[PDB]
Amino acid sequence: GNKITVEVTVYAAIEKVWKYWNEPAHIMKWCQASPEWHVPAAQNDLKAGGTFTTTMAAKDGSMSFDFGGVYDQVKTNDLIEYTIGDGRKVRIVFTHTGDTTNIVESFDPEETNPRELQQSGWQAILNSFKSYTENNLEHHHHHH
């Protein structure tokens, strides 16, 4: 129920996405991936016992917030997680069938807010990745 889980199929070498998914400059390009939000600055240091800070606010500047925490453990192509001030639990498990990488991330929803709205939210942004790859137009492929 509350253990909302989402997944996305990405066609790229684990080593390639790892760099992109960790590169801060890249995130600042599609951060939130919504026009009702912007990223005037962001910071991230991939390292154990290290901390990060992401500055983001609504375009109208009506709402403002900053995400920060500390990495409990970091291992190349294995598991990435961090402790959130709110005490929530977020873990990103890296797995690949063979010729396609699968990113899995669980989220801890609040009791006050309805799960349905936020559930579709995480899935919505994830869908954008699929649409991006569709840019292949021809999408031609040999056999497989």
Coordinates of C-alpha atoms in Angstrom, one line a residue:
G1 CA 0.0 0.0 0.0
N2 CA 2.1 2.9 1.3
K3 CA 5.2 1.0 0.0
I4 CA 4.7 2.6 -3.4
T5 CA 7.1 1.1 -6.0
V6 CA 7.8 2.3 -9.5
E7 CA 10.1 1.1 -12.3
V8 CA 11.5 2.3 -15.7
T9 CA 13.2 0.6 -18.6
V10 CA 16.3 2.4 -19.8
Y11 CA 18.4 1.2 -22.8
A12 CA 21.9 2.1 -21.8
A13 CA 25.0 0.6 -20.2
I14 CA 24.9 0.6 -16.4
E15 CA 28.1 2.6 -16.4
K16 CA 26.6 5.3 -18.7
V17 CA 23.4 6.0 -16.8
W18 CA 25.3 5.8 -13.5
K19 CA 27.3 8.9 -14.5
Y20 CA 24.2 10.8 -15.9
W21 CA 22.0 9.9 -12.9
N22 CA 24.8 11.2 -10.6
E23 CA 25.9 14.2 -12.7
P24 CA 24.4 17.3 -11.0
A25 CA 24.6 19.5 -14.1
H26 CA 22.4 17.0 -16.0
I27 CA 19.7 16.9 -13.2
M28 CA 19.6 20.8 -13.1
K29 CA 18.5 20.4 -16.8
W30 CA 15.4 18.2 -16.2
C31 CA 15.0 18.7 -12.4
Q32 CA 11.4 17.9 -11.4
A33 CA 10.8 17.8 -15.2
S34 CA 7.8 20.1 -14.6
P35 CA 7.2 23.8 -15.9
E36 CA 5.6 24.7 -12.5
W37 CA 9.1 24.3 -11.0
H38 CA 12.7 25.5 -11.6
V39 CA 16.2 24.8 -10.3
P40 CA 18.3 28.0 -10.0
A41 CA 21.1 26.0 -8.3
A42 CA 21.9 22.5 -7.1
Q43 CA 24.8 20.6 -5.3
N44 CA 25.7 17.0 -5.0
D45 CA 28.9 15.1 -3.8
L46 CA 28.7 11.3 -4.5
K47 CA 30.6 10.0 -1.5
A48 CA 30.0 8.0 1.7
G49 CA 29.4 10.2 4.8
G50 CA 29.0 13.1 2.3
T51 CA 26.0 15.5 2.1
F52 CA 24.1 17.3 -0.7
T53 CA 21.8 20.3 -1.2
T54 CA 19.2 20.9 -4.0
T55 CA 17.7 24.4 -4.3
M56 CA 14.3 24.4 -6.1
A57 CA 11.3 26.7 -6.0
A58 CA 8.0 27.2 -7.8
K59 CA 8.2 29.4 -11.0
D60 CA 5.8 31.9 -9.4
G61 CA 8.0 31.7 -6.3
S62 CA 4.9 31.0 -4.3
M63 CA 6.5 27.9 -2.7
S64 CA 10.2 27.3 -1.9
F65 CA 12.0 24.3 -0.4
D66 CA 15.5 22.6 -0.2
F67 CA 16.3 18.9 -0.1
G68 CA 19.3 17.7 1.9
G69 CA 20.7 14.6 3.7
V70 CA 23.7 12.4 4.2
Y71 CA 24.7 9.2 2.3
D72 CA 24.8 6.1 4.5
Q73 CA 26.7 4.0 2.0
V74 CA 27.8 4.3 -1.7
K75 CA 28.9 1.5 -4.0
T76 CA 29.4 1.7 -7.8
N77 CA 26.7 -0.2 -9.6
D78 CA 25.1 -1.8 -6.5
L79 CA 23.0 0.3 -4.0
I80 CA 22.5 4.1 -3.4
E81 CA 20.6 5.5 -0.4
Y82 CA 20.6 8.4 2.1
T83 CA 19.0 9.4 5.3
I84 CA 16.2 12.1 5.1
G85 CA 15.7 14.7 7.8
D86 CA 11.9 13.9 7.8
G87 CA 13.0 10.3 8.7
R88 CA 11.5 8.9 5.4
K89 CA 13.2 5.9 3.7
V90 CA 14.3 6.0 0.1
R91 CA 16.5 3.4 -1.6
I92 CA 17.5 3.0 -5.3
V93 CA 18.3 -0.6 -6.4
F94 CA 20.2 -1.0 -9.6
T95 CA 19.4 -4.1 -11.8
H96 CA 19.6 -5.0 -15.5
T97 CA 18.0 -7.9 -17.4
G98 CA 20.8 -7.9 -19.9
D99 CA 20.5 -5.4 -22.8
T100 CA 18.2 -3.0 -20.7
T101 CA 18.8 -1.3 -17.3
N102 CA 15.9 -1.3 -14.8
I103 CA 15.9 1.5 -12.1
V104 CA 13.8 0.6 -9.0
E105 CA 13.0 3.2 -6.3
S106 CA 10.6 2.9 -3.3
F107 CA 9.0 6.0 -1.6
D108 CA 7.4 6.6 1.8
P109 CA 4.0 8.5 1.3
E110 CA 2.4 10.6 4.0
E111 CA -0.9 9.6 5.7
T112 CA -2.4 13.1 5.4
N113 CA -1.9 13.4 1.6
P114 CA -3.6 10.8 -0.8
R115 CA -1.3 8.1 -2.3
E116 CA -3.0 8.2 -5.7
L117 CA -1.9 11.7 -6.5
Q118 CA 1.7 11.2 -5.6
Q119 CA 1.8 7.7 -6.9
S120 CA 0.9 8.9 -10.4
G121 CA 3.4 11.7 -9.9
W122 CA 6.4 9.5 -9.6
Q123 CA 5.2 7.4 -12.5
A124 CA 4.5 10.5 -14.6
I125 CA 8.0 11.8 -14.5
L126 CA 9.4 8.3 -15.1
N127 CA 7.3 8.0 -18.3
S128 CA 9.1 11.1 -19.7
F129 CA 12.3 8.9 -20.0
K130 CA 10.4 6.5 -22.3
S131 CA 9.1 9.3 -24.4
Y132 CA 12.6 10.7 -24.7
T133 CA 13.9 7.4 -26.1
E134 CA 11.0 7.3 -28.5
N135 CA 12.8 10.1 -30.3
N136 CA 14.4 7.3 -32.3
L137 CA 11.6 7.9 -34.8
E138 CA 12.6 5.0 -37.0
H139 CA 13.0 2.8 -33.8
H140 CA 14.4 0.3 -36.3
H141 CA 16.1 -2.8 -34.7
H142 CA 17.6 -6.1 -35.8
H143 CA 15.4 -9.0 -34.8
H144 CA 15.3 -8.1 -31.0

